[PDB]
A paper describes a structure:
The adenosine triphosphate (ATP) synthases, also known as F-ATPases or F1Fo-ATPases, are multi-subunit enzymes found in energy-transducing membranes in mitochondria, chloroplasts and eubacteria. They catalyse the synthesis of ATP from ADP and inorganic phosphate by using energy from a transmembrane electrochemical gradient of protons, known as the proton motive force (or pmf). Three α-subunits and three β-subunits are arranged in alternation around a central stalk made from single copies of the γ- and ɛ-subunits, and in the intact ATP synthase, the central stalk is associated with a ring of c-subunits in the membrane domain of the complex.
Crystals of the F1-ATPase complex from F. nucleatum have the unit cell parameters a = 111.9 Å, b = 200.2 Å, c = 201.7 Å, β = 102.2° and belong to the space group P21 with two F1-complexes in the asymmetric unit (referred to as molecules 1 and 2, respectively). The structure was solved to 3.6 Å resolution by molecular replacement with the α3β3-subcomplex, with no ligands or water molecules, taken from the structure of the F1-ATPase from Caldalkalibacillus thermarum containing the mutations Asp99Ala and Arg92Ala in the ɛ-subunit. Each of the final models of the two complexes contains three α-subunits (αE, αTP and αDP), three β-subunits (βE, βTP and βDP), and single copies of the γ- and ɛ-subunits, and a total of 6420 amino acid residues were resolved. Similarly, additional density in the nucleotide-binding sites of the βTP- and βDP-subunits provides strong evidence for the presence in each site of an ADP molecule with a magnesium ion. The N-terminal domain of the ɛ-subunit is folded into a 10-stranded β-sandwich, and the C-terminal domain consists of a hairpin of two α-helices, lying alongside the β-sandwich. This conformation of two α-helices is known as the ‘down’ position. In F. nucleatum, the ɛ-subunit is ‘down’ with no bound ATP, but, in contrast to the F1-ATPases from C. thermarum and M. smegmatis, it is intrinsically active in ATP hydrolysis, and that activity can be stimulated by LDAO.
Author numbering:
A (entry chain G): 227 to 282
B (entry chain B): 27 to 500
C (entry chain F): 1 to 462
D (entry chain E): 1 to 460
E (entry chain C), G (entry chain A): 251 to 375
F (entry chain D): 155 to 308
Write the structure that this text describes.
């Protein structure tokens, strides 16, 4: 029982360590995806405002 | 006739008169500054100033030259530093030229070209190994900020020493600190002899940055039409595009994706089309292009990167992951490709290096799950060792290219498995000393260089010489 | 007749003033430029007897007040059998040399599309050879096929395989139309056409990157005009291949700015829908003949919401989407099996087994895509035993869709394997039912038949 | 004098009409008001002998049809020793209330960059006299350094020392360009500059947020012109501080907006690259001298891909990242040794010894930051046996990077300490090798050379 | 008007809008959000409102309308899709996450609503 | 949110005394008849005045209809002095009508393509809807949220 | 000027900006990011700077400024928030996650900063 629970937590250390690492790298990609859209959203906003004024 | 400036600002000018002026005609403003007649309106003429627009103002006279915008091209340029206009930058006297060639010139047709035959060797073990380049090919060098992009470009220029190939490194939106240090390095190593440097740096006006790459290839055309081989290097296009964007938005041309105008594709598409290998009918010359592009956090699915990828004949990816990990040049074999292929590559080279490309791609996938299985297959463990060793061989230092003969042996060592018993640590020096052994003693290097193939005899002859060095090593 | 003078020039657009009579829209004008003459196309009537014209070639050199003459008719082209086995210009000129053309008849570029009731309803498929396509998104005879792909995901390669599978060993006429793509590919193809011997029956038109906007715009039509002639005059079934049709719609945006039109979303021309319809509806199978068009669509920045790729979707009977995620994963052809769809995939057409199997693999792959979020952060061990088997099967099915291409033989270094429709459905069935659970997933890449998949698994063991 | 007349006024921009002669672009104009004369800067020529200008001060008071005097030259500023320890306006005027300037030389703000042959083509390493920087983030002569900081993390202290270290250490003089400076933090800077006694060994050029966008744009160049003089005329090295470079970038777009240009990607000026380059290409190393520059960079939405920092990163040679975590721990200067990076850290530049030391130092520091998760919660005891010896080195390494500062004398009391590169290398090289393993970690705190570190352990 | 029940179908209003965009931007009526003109709501408002059920006094004749909209990668925040949703008396949502999953017709009950409810149902239903 | 207003009327306006005023500002005409049906059967119709200007109506109508329904309620609080309940559905459509026309009135468009005088146009109408010393009105005005985005100006 | 100490509170500058935006856009002044003019930073800078402490020589009085700014879904990188933050000496960041959690006033210490700091505190504090 001591060995099993000792092993249990040693196994849980592994699964959660990789889980954290996977999450860390997922956060990175998403942050870039966010800023990609951020940039686009600002550009487009201005395009519409300038496009509306210049048409006038 | 002639004209006068009635309005100017932001590198754009409006001119009165000029009755018999034509589209894209070179102009002449006072204080030595010049421009290109752009918009021939009913009542006025538009012009893009090719220099400091401060020196020009309203009232100032403008005289049309009569000729289209053109760059002075010659064989005197070899070993000189030039600007977009064609003036001497280096400060080594004036430049006597044979021809005057136009910067903007439609590319050749379909039948005017032929398939590439002879290779262009960058002199790097990884590049010429598994992603070969041909004379007339267009190969992109794509990567983040500081991943050894320009390093690969100059190392190519270096290796062109003693192969009768002219070089044109055009520096667009760079800093002069970089351009000057390149000029110094090339001249020291003695590769500046046959190299031209065109310069439209970050300080210089956007139109000069816009003009620079077109001027570069126009000088490249001079040698091609005669019937010679040329190398041109656009460093870089992602700065070139922004320069053109600046112009377009100041000309009040409607913005598109990422504010870049609609014809930012046609900007680069028509430019790179002029780099190709002509048929024997037109004299078997070639212009080989190595454009560079600077991605933001490896965003290769951005507007310009995709534009350039879709016009080039393949690309070379450079990750900061590999570069910072300590693996230079940090080339990603799994992604990088060359569309020409083995049409322009040596037999000897194809015999040894062809196997590697795919093995590396698989190698990396094996490394990823090597974390999990505390124990792993022993046949697979051998591949990792091979993978560690082959990667160390692909790593080489800067300003030190290899000849094809030296590359062949470098691959033969590891792929055949004569290095399997040798430890990973001292793998780099083991290569160095072995080639030095073969150089003086057996002179098998010269055998390969002339023959350009490994036959039944020479292959076993090579296996004998390495077996001697194996014993000699301590 | 009808001679005018140039008032003002603006890059790729020129404004001309006629004294007397004014030319109708789409009429061809000609100016005597240094040495060679330049062809212009009238677009708009401004006023004061002035017309705005888009140039078909570089305007560099044009002075103000130069003479220009109206032809009267639109841009007419050599059309018929004379063009076969010769590469043509935007203007219809031969650029291959080898003498002038033996042109008998002529026909204008701009002509209205086939009206309703002149069209015909045909819903019969044809096997391409490619496993992913033949099963999930089978192409239709006399249909409009679409190949969507980002920058360098193997859409030109796919065309070159489809011409190699369909147009190579079949008696029908072919047509190819190079639009704003690589001039290298032009020479590469023209060589591979002649040496193979397909050149004879097929006809080529080219207006590549090097060509100005006006050229890239109208080349899309001339090639289609040629393809139209064969379904109309001869009354013969023809194949039309275009690469890349995006570059036509792209050219529009470059010109539209100069024509003074108010830009729409993402700085495109406001008449994007109609300008494309006036072309795309012309590419259709009538009663008189039948055109099977297979045209490639470039997706800028991998953005399919972009209005140029977005609008094209509604002109296609079958669509094959190419994803970068798939290409990057190391699988070719990089065909998304869920995003790609065809109208023909119905029990009516493909039968019971074809349809039943096609929908099943979609259901499996969909489930794999659903769980792909959870696996990424945790792992395979967490998801239930029920899911575990569906995921393992999905990964095999996904990798089985890959197969070597005959065009990419020099690349891959493998004999490209044409797989018939009946042997594909057999394979995906056996994999689905779990009769190949014992085989590893690394025995399905670049295989072809399922018989060859197990042969690769035995090859390992040795 | 060539004279004109105002045609129209719209907030910041002013259109002016001349009869006889028209002023060239970037020429300084002047309109007479009872309060003070207003300086304008012509940007473009419109037509009908009219030109558009941007005001360096407010325009609340101007009428149409006022007299305006063309200077006939781009706004010129005084240079030389007369500038040292003075607070300068963008127009070169004094605002420290320390009498008039008696400068004997005047250089214009707008001028073209050094030509190709003039530039020194050699990577000469620059030592600040600080351990953490000179080792891990080596500066370059004629270089551009990114100062990632802000807030109370001892930034102004680091700057004041860097100014003092070049002045004492080498034959050099510093310049400070307060681009979009707070009027509060301007007074407090000038205050602490005189307190520390570095005021004399630097030039101050403030362009407050208070002033219009035209002012904030050109004030960056004002200080650069002063630095340009000390390199061009006198044969000495220079140190040009800019804070904040983004406030120069943003001033540009604000101007571009007012002039009514079409905004480029993300709403910045279309001439973002050139306007950025025009300044940064001027900062370089000639044969005569060298202008090194430490520039603070704001990064909008903590985004590096954003064009403002992205185009800035083009010019940057090295970066120095101040950490609040290290500042809170009580280690000054902070300077995160992992975040901070440089071009100059290579065998080709500095040397084989310097390189492999810095690498090993960072790898051990990284290994400590990995095991920071365990020791923070569990403890130093509850850890692997083999790593604890490498952790005990790492903690000493981090604490050895702490440095007594000459500027801090007033506060801390302890005397300062300049340290050359060769002294540091040996010190760190011994620690990782494991010669001074027996020396406690408390001895390393706020000590100069390794020679003094071992000396303090016996003292304790 | 005669007093008969009708079922009109618009396939589809998302394309209808683009046509109106073409007209406007050529006529030089200035652009708005996503380059669409000012009254692209009013365009579809007056069309859909036209569909109704008249009182027994005017026959009791109906004209049921089923407009269609084409979303871009499930983007309902887009200008036209959101416009039409707010006009109609409910909506029916189709997601490829279901369609591919093998649930046809791929209706999402969660978002799909009918603003008439059981009023338009037989008692048995 | 429409159903919620309907309930609030059913709970408050039906049970309690005093008059009320409903303002159909640019929503479904179907819902107009559906209310009018419930109003007459419940017997609330007598103690309420209905102003309408629905989707089908042009911009000008949908714009100034809110002011009509408001002006009716203004009278009842001041002149009459009775307790008033003002229900509006929907007060977004007022702004929307503004934006349609704004472009053609020569106004440069502001953030996310609205009229540049969004705050003042709304402020002029909203400040007018209030209780005073002379009498009080209870304003319950539903507000549309374009694409569930609360960051949207409207 | 009379040597007294003053407190002023702008509630709020986000509304103020929008009022100035209106004027500019109707005056046909060229728009920028989020349709704001180039001199919107200049607008707020010359207001906030005007609140400071004079020397003993000029009375010794002061004006302390408490400007307020409204963020949309915690957007601090928006054009007005980002630049008003840049002007001020310190910032007090409030969060609804704390507010709903029961923290009052819902202040985030971690991100909140005062560059003045200890200087404006008695020894005891
Ligand atoms: N093959 C190599 N081996 C060792 N070091 C290298 C190699 N290639 C480049 N470097 C080093 O990396 C640094 C950056 O290289 P390089 O400037 O070529 O990249 P880049 O992407 O062109 O940079 P930038 O984008 O800043 O112009 C150089 O200082 C160089 O010394
Ligand atoms: N079917 C395929 N099999 C193997 N590799 C392929 C295949 N299709 C494309 N590739 C690889 O991807 C590259 C892109 O091909 P290409 O057709 O030029 O894409 P695109 O036309 O979309 O730019 C090729 O050079 C090749 O290396
Ligand atoms: N109190 C409620 N109980 C149950 N369902 C409701 C209730 N209120 C609204 N709904 C649901 O929402 C729909 C009506 O919403 P509606 O009032 O039109 O909102 P909106 O005014 O935002 O369109 C109905 O079809 C119904 O299913
Ligand atoms: Mg470089
Ligand atoms: Mg292609
Ligand atoms: Mg409602």
């Amino acid at each position: 029982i001591l060995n099993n629970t000792a092993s249990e937590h040693s196994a849980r250390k592994n699964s959660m360590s990789s889980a954290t690492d996977n999450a860390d790298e997922m956060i990175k990609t998403l942050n870039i995806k966010y800023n990609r859209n951020r940039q686009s959203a600002i550009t487009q906003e201005i395009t519409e405002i300038v496009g509306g004024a210049s048409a006038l | 006739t002639s004209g006068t400036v009635l309005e100017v600002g932001d590198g754009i000018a409006r001119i009165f008169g000029l009755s018999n002026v034509m589209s894209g005609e070179l102009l002449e403003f006072p204080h030595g500054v010049m421009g290109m007649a752009l918009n021939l309106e009913e009542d006025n003429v538009g012009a893009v100033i090719l220099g400091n627009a401060s020196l020009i103002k309203e009232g100032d006279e403008v005289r049309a030259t009569g000729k289209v915008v053109s760059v002075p091209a010659g064989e005197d340029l070899l070993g000189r530093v030039i600007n977009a206009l064609g003036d001497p930058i280096d400060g080594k006297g004036e430049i006597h030229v044979d021809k005057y060639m136009p910067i903007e010139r439609k590319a050749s047709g379909i039948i005017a070209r032929q398939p590439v035959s002879e290779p262009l060797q960058t002199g790097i073990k990884s590049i010429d190994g598994m992603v070969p380049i041909g004379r007339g090919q267009r190969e992109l060098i794509i990567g983040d900020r500081q991943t050894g992009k320009t390093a690969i470009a100059i190392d190519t220029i270096i290796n062109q020493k003693g192969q009768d190939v002219k070089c044109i490194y055009v520096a667009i939106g760079q800093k002069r600190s970089t351009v000057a240090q390149i000029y110094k390095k090339l001249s020291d190593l003695g590769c500046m002899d046959y190299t031209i440097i065109v310069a439209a740096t970050a300080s210089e006006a956007a139109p000069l940055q816009y003009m620079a790459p077109y001027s570069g290839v126009a000088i490249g055309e001079y040698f091609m039409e005669k019937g010679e081989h040329v190398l041109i290097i656009y460093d870089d296009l992602s700065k070139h595009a922004v320069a053109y964007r600046e112009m377009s938005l100041l000309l009040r041309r409607p913005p598109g994706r990422e504010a870049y105008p609609g014809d930012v594709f046609y900007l680069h598409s028509r430019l790179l089309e002029r780099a190709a290998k002509l048929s024997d009918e037109l004299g078997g010359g070639s212009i080989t292009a190595l454009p560079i592009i600077e991605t933001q956090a490896g965003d290769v699915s951005a507007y310009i990167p995709t534009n350039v990828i879709s016009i080039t004949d393949g690309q070379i990816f450079l990750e900061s992951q590999l570069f910072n990990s300590g693996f230079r040049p940090a080339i990603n074999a799994g992604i990088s490709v060359s569309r020409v292929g083995g049409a322009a590559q040596i037999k000897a080279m194809k015999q040894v290096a062809s196997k590697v490309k795919l093995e590396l791609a698989q190698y990396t996938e094996l490394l990823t799950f090597a974390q999990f299985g505390s124990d792993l297959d022993k046949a697979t463990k051998a591949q990792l060792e091979r993978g560690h060793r082959i990667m160390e061989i692909l790593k080489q230092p800067q300003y030190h290219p290899f000849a094809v003969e030296r590359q062949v042996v470098s691959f033969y060592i590891v792929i055949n498995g004569h290095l399997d018993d040798i430890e990973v640590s001292k793998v780099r020096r083991f290569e160095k000393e072995l080639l030095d052994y073969l150089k003086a003693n057996t002179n098998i290097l010269t055998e390969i260089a002339d023959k350009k193939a490994l036959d039944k005899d020479l292959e076993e002859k090579l296996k004998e010489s390495i077996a001697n060095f194996k014993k000699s090593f301590n | 007749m009808n001679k005018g003078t140039i008032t003002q020039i603006i890059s790729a657009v020129v404004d001309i003033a006629f004294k007397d009579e004014l030319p109708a829209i789409y009429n061809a004008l000609k100016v005597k430029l240094e040495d060679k003459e330049l062809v212009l196309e009238v677009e708009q009537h401004l006023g004061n007897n002035v017309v705005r014209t888009v140039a078909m070639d570089s305007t560099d050199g044009l002075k103000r007040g130069m003479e220009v003459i109206d032809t009267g008719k639109p841009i007419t082209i050599p059309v018929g059998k004379a063009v076969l086995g010769r590469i043509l210009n935007v203007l219809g000129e031969p650029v291959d040399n080898q003498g002038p053309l033996n042109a008998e008849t002529f026909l204008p570029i701009h002509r209205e599309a086939p009206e309703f009731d002149d069209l015909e309803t045909e819903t019969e498929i044809f096997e391409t050879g490619i496993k992913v396509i033949d099963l999930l998104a089978p192409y239709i005879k006399g249909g409009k096929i679409g190949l969507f792909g980002g920058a360098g995901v193997g859409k030109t390669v796919l065309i070159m395989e489809l011409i190699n599978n369909i147009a190579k060993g079949h008696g029908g006429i072919s047509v190819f139309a190079g639009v704003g793509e690589r001039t290298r590919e032009g020479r590469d193809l023209y060589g591979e056409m002649t040496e193979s011997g397909v050149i004879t029956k097929t006809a080529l038109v080219y207006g590549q990157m090097n060509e100005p906007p006006g050229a890239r715009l109208r080349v899309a039509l001339t090639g289609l005009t040629v393809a139209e002639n064969f379904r109309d005059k001869d009354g013969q079934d023809v194949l039309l291949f275009i690469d890349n049709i995006f570059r036509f719609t792209q050219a529009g945006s470059e010109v539209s700015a100069l024509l003074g039109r108010i830009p729409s979303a993402v700085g495109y021309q406001p008449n994007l829908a109609t300008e494309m319809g006036a072309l795309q509806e012309r590419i259709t199978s009538t009663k008189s003949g039948s055109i099977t068009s297979v045209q490639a669509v470039y997706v800028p920045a991998d953005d399919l919401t972009d209005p140029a790729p977005a609008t094209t979707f509604s002109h296609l009977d079958a669509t094959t989407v190419l994803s970068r995620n798939i290409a990057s994963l190391g699988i070719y052809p990089a065909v998304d099996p869920l995003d790609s769809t065809s109208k023909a995939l119905s029990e009516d057409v493909v039968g019971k087994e074809h349809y039943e199997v096609a929908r099943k693999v979609q259901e499996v792959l969909q489930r794999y895509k659903e769980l792909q979020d959870i696996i990424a952060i945790l792992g395979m061990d967490e998801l239930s035993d029920e899911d575990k088997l569906t995921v393992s099967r999905a990964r095999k099915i996904e990798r089985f869709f890959s197969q070597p291409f005959s065009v990419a033989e020099q690349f891959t270094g493998m004999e490209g394997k044409y797989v018939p429709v009946k042997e594909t459905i057999r394979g995906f069935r056996e994999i689905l039912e779990g009769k190949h659970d014992d085989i590893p997933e690394q025995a399905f890449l670049y295989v072809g038949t399922i018989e060859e998949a197990v042969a690769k698994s035995k090859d390992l063991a040795k």
